[model samples]
Target: GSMYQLEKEPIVGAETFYVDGAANRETKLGKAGYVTNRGRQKVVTLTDTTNQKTELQAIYLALQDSGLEVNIVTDSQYALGIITQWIHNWKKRGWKTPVKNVDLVNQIIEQLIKKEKVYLAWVPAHKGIGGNEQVDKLVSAGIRKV
Candidate 1:
């Protein structure tokens, strides 16, 4: 039994055990700290390009700074396709896109999988979960200094 803060209010919750403790996603909910439980359970839900690159970059930087691995969750079939499918070709092709933001996207991709243990998962979005919704809002709000 432990007391934790949620939505700026202290809430007590029971603890559950897990065989593995990998975070599949990182979410910011104000000052309560970025929640990592969804990714741990592999139950991430994400919206289309909700500053996914920014979120990924933040996660990548945090992981790199902390000596941890980075894993990102993204929507936008286009973005995911750019990363998972066309990335290698683009890499060989020198990161050219038929449109703008390709270089930035490439940087995000590079940062995401830099440590080699990096991974990405496609999490569906708008499921009405408070945490997911909060994350959506947070990512949508872009990076904030805290």
Candidate 2:
């Protein structure tokens, strides 16, 4: 049965984004969620004033509150390359000089880097696998975030 299949294996939160709104305004109750091989799960809400840092913080805070460590699997090579390589060096260099798109991921990395749990791993898209396909569908479905 479909229900049985879902229960048999847990679909972890593989990929996600945090839409930042306004800071000090009480973060929204729900927005961020995760999609798995089997289905989608709305874990928490995002409330922030800014998209870059705020959204990044919202994502980490939500995962932390949920007692889930952040492990990112993305298809964006630039994202992966920047974080794993350039970001580390920049952080060591005091985050002085700016790097393209570093504004967002940099903040996210700065937050959980000590834990070293948040990491980047590559995942190719449109492989025709069932679970991956389902998640892509769910993301496209645009489940409401309110």
Candidate 3:
């Protein structure tokens, strides 16, 4: 569940990197999927039931798997808010969030604590963003496979 920390590299100018995750009502069986690196390196995982938060959690998992410090981009406001803002309060409150997704949220929070360089960003879904669109495709493929 860990990897060697890669050398910190400057993102520089317009080119930066991030991670993403996706899930859908179609899957029915919780088949979530995520993508990092513009889908250059696809990562997929399956579950018996799915939630929007789970997809976002998968993004952190992928980031930890890569062992790189980078911003995570997501279309889910819920995910983005929880990771970037809410988790801090939750941690101070002994990791108790009076909300759903607490388990997966805590897991990601632990990873964020360990990998201090992790960052998160938000994009509106269906907005034609390349990385978000790629995650859509990746999750779709993963659903078909399951």
Candidate 4:
């Protein structure tokens, strides 16, 4: 397991996961990562037509598999905003959103609402951060694998 400095006490039972989704334009491949605090993680590659939509689907797959209350870190402002800001409004309006990815977004929103607790945090991409860089490499590796 990887070790890191803990500046303060963590929640008694909460778990944290870093998540990232990437799409390679040239190869039409998408990849996602779910990395735990202990460095345990999973990387998934999309075989279907890939885009940011597919990237979000990768995140959905990860969330669906997780049973712990988690803080999710991602680099996509679009995904972050949809979860933290837009989803509430969509819920109030009976889950209606005109966004092109409505189906996928709706699925994510529904899954999130069912979770006991979930947090979304955004980080800018390609900034040499460990989690983000790790997922980036995973996506590149996934592209090559395809």
Candidate 5:
């Protein structure tokens, strides 16, 4: 078990979604993946214009088509803040003018609350941990694809 200050890793009685978003910024293509019991799963998204999209997409996809408790861990502070904090204010503001990647933000918010209990944590990346390493591997495989 990896040490976590926010919440425990690979939580019991909840699906642990250790997710990472990778991008080929020059090419502007990106992919995100989450750890699953069956296997790590990847989401190839064209909207990965920003690395933000990939992280958000991973969480959005993990929400389960609309869940039991889904515990998600990511290395992205940007994504963590958006989904857990800023999203509510953005909603309250109705995005009056604009917000960064508001599309995925809305979708993530929509899917996130569908869960019975949602846990979000920011884990440092490249720590050589367990599932987080797998998600990193998945993202690497996804990014170099033809």
Candidate 6:
């Protein structure tokens, strides 16, 4: 029911980052997996975080690493819409609503606007697109590279 919400273009380019975020309750850490187009990967782990915030951070990592005409692929529609689609509404409300992780959200928005040509693509989690699958592994594969 959720896949059709965005433009969801059949990705044709090479500049894609399939990003994922996971929460490990044992250490209460949020791990962000950023998967590059050529199978390069980077994971940044943060303390005092969450699945949701890490999802946002995964994107933030990608955004910082990217140039124009790159696509950021993510599984969390909430995080996807937060920095792209839903920001207008949030701003319309004067950013007063009690949305979580506005700090990171604000950073992502700034990074996004600084770039000229950035696209957001969505994929369903654990269903295994190439990049998505790899990033998902990094999320679950612990701090060490998998």
Against the true structure, whose TM-score is highest?
6
Candidate 1 structure quality by residue, lDDT tens digits, 1-146: 01111121212231111111111234522211123433422222233323434444333333333222344444334445555554445435454564744665556555544443444444455556544454554443433431
Tell me the tens digit of each residue's lDDT in model 2 across 1-146: 11011111222453332212112334422233344322334334344433233334334443443323344444444444544554445426444544544566656454544442343355554557443344334333323322
Model 2, stretches more than 4 Å misplaced?
Answer: 1-33, 36-40, 43-70, 91-99, 114-116, 142-146
Position 117, candidate 3: lDDT: 59
The 10-residue segment with the lowest total lDDT in model 1 = 14-23
Looking at model 4, the pairs that clash are none
Candidates sorted on lDDT, descending: 6, 5, 4, 3, 2, 1
In the predicted model 5, the residue pairs found to clash are none
Question: Per-residue alpha-carbon lDDT of model 4 for 1-146, expressed as tens digits?
Answer: 01111112333466666676667678677777677676668877775545566557656865787665656667777776655555446426455565577688778866776675566667787657577667666665756433
Comparing 1 with 2 on TM-score, the higher-scoring candidate is 2
The deviation in Å at residue 13 for candidate 5 is 1.3
Instruction: Report how far residue 24 has shifted in candidate 3, in Å.
Output: 4.3
After TM-score superposition, the amount by which residue 137's alpha carbon in candidate 4 deviates from its true location, in angstroms, is 1.1
After superposition, candidate 6 runs with Cα above 4 Å error: 1-14, 90-95, 143-146
Error of 1 at 75 (Å): 2.7
Tens-digit per-residue lDDT, 1-146, candidate 5: 11112233545676677887777877778777688654546555664365777777777777753256777878889888766554445435443623678777777766755555667888788657587777877776657642
User: Which structure is stronger by TM-score: 2 or 3?
Assistant: 3
Q: What is the C-alpha lDDT of each candidate?
A: 0.37, 0.39, 0.55, 0.64, 0.67, 0.73
Give the range where candidate 4 is weakest over 10 consecutive residues by summed lDDT: 1-10
lDDT of 6 at 54: 82
Per-candidate TM-scores read 0.44, 0.45, 0.67, 0.74, 0.76, 0.79
